[PDB]
């Protein structure tokens, strides 16, 4: 309203910028030609001629002013008809893209810990300490360590968690009785390692941590105690005993490091009062140290549990000793083998996951998998029906970052008005973009409408908040379907009820021929994809009609099967009772359906899923959506009766969190504490994986009870095969008939 020099200059700048001098209305010296078909009504005299250009593009109407966006507004991408050719839709991007784009990382992990107790004294099975899962080779390496470290810093900040975590557990080993007290009220406590004094100390003396009594006095030690003498747990200590001797010192280049640990535990399991609780912390529980420990202190204490509190990706585990009595017998059990094995099984998962992330302070290149790539245009003229560069670059960009975000901004320089349009290019886009045969256009109307200045772009690998427990589960199948569809022999696959916009195209090898279907119309211009490879069918699969002429050797009903039973207002068992047989007829060898049945427990989640028992039904977010369910057993036999020869199996979000390259891989924060929620939300809704191509199992107990010998029978013609049953993403039973190593019993 009140033009300011900064503004006038930003207009006189925009005017000077090379462009096309409007040509609709030619200039006169005594007359202003005004469009007849225009709001302007000529005054009177001889100064206004009603000249009409041959084709004026403007129509009339106004525009209500909208205030400046406080933050970069994301823009859902809706496609147009014309599509640019990969070649042209590439340089178009590379002519206006911000290539070596500097980007902030933020924090990918913000949640608590994902603690996991393990009773070593608990398991009654002896397990040769010589043959445990020894530290994996790669572990100590420039590449692996680099990542193990990178991940560490990518965690918004840790002992406050870890330490507290160990005490949350240590509070369970407390025996109040006189018969044999353990951490009995006012027990003395030794503590080694402090930075001022550990924050947990305040709490122990406060009795703050529920379950654990308030200790009489706490005696600190370590290398920087600042309140107690400085001891070196490697060698001998000149102090007295304590009920609880919580040791948390670090070990760090492997053999002497083992000696360091074996020694430290030796003196920590020395400072404990007879019948106390030593809590050492090993850094590398190698099957080299697990022989020395179970040999030297094979007596020293009564119980023993590994308490690995995964705050960040490291293999340092905590060990607690039961009763510091001289004649104990802490034998290495199969528990240890499993515990230890689960640990590593996760570092491969957590490492493989972090590979998708760039190293801090490195200019963004095209190399980084999670790199944020944008396209800054200057006063871009996004036009519909024209392949003008500004609108041509818009194509590529959105094509290079579809399943992601795509945030567009407009900062007003006192010169022109730049408009970057970034997005988190991940590996989930590289998979999708590859399947694209052409780069479709985007309805630039929404962009042309804006006309308001937003805040400057940010370019940050991760968003700020931890994804919803529901997403931790969903991105737990996008990794599962990804690994299943990656199988060669799979051939042609269809998706019963893909999203309005095929979200499965990213989770499939760019070569497999898939055909997503949904009642609503597909969001992506189905034309840009090669017809032979990708097909799209509209209308629901719930209706008998839809199944005419649709033959795929494998179907996947993930995220839909539950909504169909609810939509068609039908019983869950009865629904799949009509769907499975259709997939059989559709010519299907494999099946994957995100059915929602309580196979683990009928127990529910307080805020995520309510299990109404009067009527078999769920309540995701209590109300937001209600979908009927089935029972593990009834639904199990109903499907076995449908496909008698087919082999069934339940895949569910495995605690190894190996699916991670889908949450940390796309650039989303999370809570290491929620992994537990989702591994419990995944149990409420497993993915029943059928396979008509093989003989099904035979369990003699049927509703198999824990701790009872059961008969399982795999019908394979060749005796020369290797049986390897694995639960939780960790193998537990492996070996040809003769020898079978079993950690499950």
């Amino acid at each position: 309203a009140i033009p300011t020099m900064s503004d006038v200059r930003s207009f006189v700048a925009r005017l000077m910028a090379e462009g096309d001098p409007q040509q609709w209305f030619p200039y006169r010296v005594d007359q202003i030609l005004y469009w007849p078909e225009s709001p302007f009504v000529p005054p009177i005299g001889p100064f206004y001629a009603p000249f009409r250009p041959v084709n004026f593009p403007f129509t009339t109407g106004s525009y209500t002013v909208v205030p400046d966006a406080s933050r970069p507004l994301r823009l859902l991408p809706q496609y147009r008809n014309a599509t640019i050719t990969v070649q042209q839709a590439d340089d178009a991007y590379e002519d206006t893209a911000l290539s070596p784009l500097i980007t902030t990382h933020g924090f990918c992990v913000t949640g608590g810990v994902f603690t996991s107790i393990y009773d070593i004294s608990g398991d009654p099975t002896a397990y040769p300490p010589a043959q445990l899962v020894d530290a994996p080779n790669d572990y100590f390496d420039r590449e692996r360590m680099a990542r193990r470290d990178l991940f560490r810093r990518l965690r918004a900040p840790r002992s406050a968690i870890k330490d507290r975590a160990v005490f949350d557990f240590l509070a369970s080993l407390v025996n109040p009785t006189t018969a044999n007290p353990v951490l009995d009220t006012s027990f003395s406590m030794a503590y080694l390692g402090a930075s001022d004094e550990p924050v947990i100390l305040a709490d122990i003396r406060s009795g703050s941590i529920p379950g654990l009594p308030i200790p009489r006095r706490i005696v600190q030690f370590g290398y920087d105690v600042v309140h107690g003498s400085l001891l070196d747990l490697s060698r001998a200590v000149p102090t007295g005993t304590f009920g609880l001797v919580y040791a948390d010192l670090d070990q760090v280049d492997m053999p002497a490091a083992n000696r360091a640990a074996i020694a430290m535990l030796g003196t920590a399991l020395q400072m404990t009062t007879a019948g106390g609780v030593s809590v050492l912390k090993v850094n590398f529980p190698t099957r080299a140290f697990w022989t020395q420990v179970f040999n030297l202190y094979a007596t020293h204490a009564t119980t023993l549990h590994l308490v690995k509190p995964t705050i960040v990706n490291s293999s340092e585990v905590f060990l607690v000793f039961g009763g510091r009595q001289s004649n104990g017998a802490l034998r290495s059990t199969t528990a240890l083998q499993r515990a230890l094995l689960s640990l590593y099984a996760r570092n491969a998962a957590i490492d493989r996951a972090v590979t998708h992330i760039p190293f801090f302070g490195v200019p963004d290149d095209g190399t980084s998998d999670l790199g944020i790539d944008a396209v800054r245009l200057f006063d871009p003229m996004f036009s519909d029906a024209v392949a003008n560069l500004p609108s041509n670059a818009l194509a590529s960009l959105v094509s290079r970052v579809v399943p992601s975000s795509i945030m567009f901004t407009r900062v007003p320089s006192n010169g022109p008005v730049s408009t970057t349009i970034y997005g988190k290019r991940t590996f989930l886009s590289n998979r999708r973009r590859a399947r694209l045969r052409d780069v479709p256009m985007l309805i630039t109307t929404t962009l042309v409408h804006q006309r308001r200045f937003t805040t400057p772009p940010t370019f940050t690998l991760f968003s700020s908040e931890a994804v919803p427990v529901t997403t931790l589960v969903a991105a737990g199948y996008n990794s599962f379907i990804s690994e299943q569809t990656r199988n060669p022999n799979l051939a042609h696959l269809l998706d019963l009820g893909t999203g309005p916009e095929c979200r499965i195209l990213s989770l499939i090898p760019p070569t497999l021929q898939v055909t997503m279907s949904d009642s609503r119309p597909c969001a992506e211009l189905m034309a840009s994809f090669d017809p032979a490879l990708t097909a799209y069918v509209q209308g629901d699969y719930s209706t008998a009609a839809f199944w005419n002429g649709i033959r795929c050797d494998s179907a996947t009903a993930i995220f839909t099967i539950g909504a169909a039973a609810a939509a068609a207002g039908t019983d869950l068992i009865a629904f799949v009772q009509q769907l499975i047989p259709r997939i059989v007829a559709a010519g299907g060898t494999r099946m994957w359906l995100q059915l929602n049945t309580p196979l683990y427990e009928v127990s529910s989640l307080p805020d995520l899923i309510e299990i109404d028992l009067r009527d078999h039904v769920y309540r995701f977010n209590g109300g937001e959506r209600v979908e009927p369910y089935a029972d593990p057993v009834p639904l199990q036999q109903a499907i076995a009766a449908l496909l008698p020869a087919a082999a069934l199996s339940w895949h569910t979000l495995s605690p190894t969190c190996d699916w991670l390259p889908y949450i940390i891989g796309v650039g989303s924060p999370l809570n290491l504490s929620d992994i537990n929620t989702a591994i419990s939300y995944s149990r409420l809704t497993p993915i029943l994986h059928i396979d008509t191509t093989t003989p099904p199992l035979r369990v003699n107990p049927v509703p198999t009870p824990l701790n009872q010998q059961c008969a399982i029978r795999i019908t394979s013609l060749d005796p020369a095969a290797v049986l390897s049953v694995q639960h939780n993403g960790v193998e537990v039973i492996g070996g040809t008939p003769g020898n079978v190593i079993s950690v499950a019993g």
């Binding site: 147009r80 008809n81 024209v386 392949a387 309805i443």
Partner: protein, 72 residues
């Protein structure tokens, strides 16, 4: 090479599409009028079916359409 008559076809084909111009804009599909001069080029050399006979057709700045273009 795009001999005189073979341009008659691709022009006659595109001509029948340009006709529908008013319906392409109305419905935001299309992408502007398709000029056949967007798929060709102005190279020059000898144009025949085989080195031997192509030697007798020296054409200068003829109008050829490259394979990848003959695709679009």
């Amino acid at each position: 090479f795009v001999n005189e008559g073979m341009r008659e076809t691709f022009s006659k084909a595109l001509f029948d599409i340009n006709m529908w111009q008013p319906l392409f804009q109305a419905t935001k599909t299309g992408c502007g009028p398709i000029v056949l001069s967007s798929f060709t080029t102005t190279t020059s050399g000898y144009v025949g079916a085989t080195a031997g006979d192509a030697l007798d057709n020296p054409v200068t700045n003829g109008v050829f359409i490259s394979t990848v273009q003959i695709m679009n």
